């Protein structure tokens, strides 16, 4: 986790490095399934979803 092998012409020995934790991190585009399912039933705004399905055709 967070380790890479650096292969290239700039190193004498291509190896694996324990990269430290960046500060601050980028945005994490991850959705957790079970916690969202654990909540009660959610209401999707069908009006908006349909108008954006039809409006964004190019």
């Amino acid at each position: 986790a967070g380790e890479c092998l650096v292969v290239g012409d700039s190193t004498p020995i291509p190896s694996i490095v324990k990269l430290e934790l960046p500060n601050p991190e980028p945005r994490s585009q991850s959705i957790k399934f079970h916690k969202k399912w654990s909540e009660s039933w959610r209401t999707p705004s069908f009006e908006e979803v349909i108008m954006r399905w039809r409006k964004e055709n190019g």
Binding site: K32, H34, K35, S38
Partner: protein, 58 residues
């Protein structure tokens, strides 16, 4: 030829340093070292753990 041999081939999958389970293929046991089966007390800690995000699958 009257030679009672009972040899098992096992593969390490983790360590139990303290009371918590770490993974990794390290800390090779020295020869003449006891083997003590497995009890459910340590198996439960490995698998069930304690967290909200769980899912029973048998």
């Amino acid at each position: 030829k009257d030679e009672d041999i009972f040899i098992l081939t096992v593969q390490p999958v983790g360590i139990f340093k303290g009371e918590e389970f770490f993974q990794g293929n390290s800390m090779l046991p020295s020869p003449t070292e006891p083997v003590f089966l497995v009890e459910d007390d340590i198996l439960n800690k490995i698998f069930s753990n304690e967290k909200t995000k769980i899912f029973h699958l048998g």
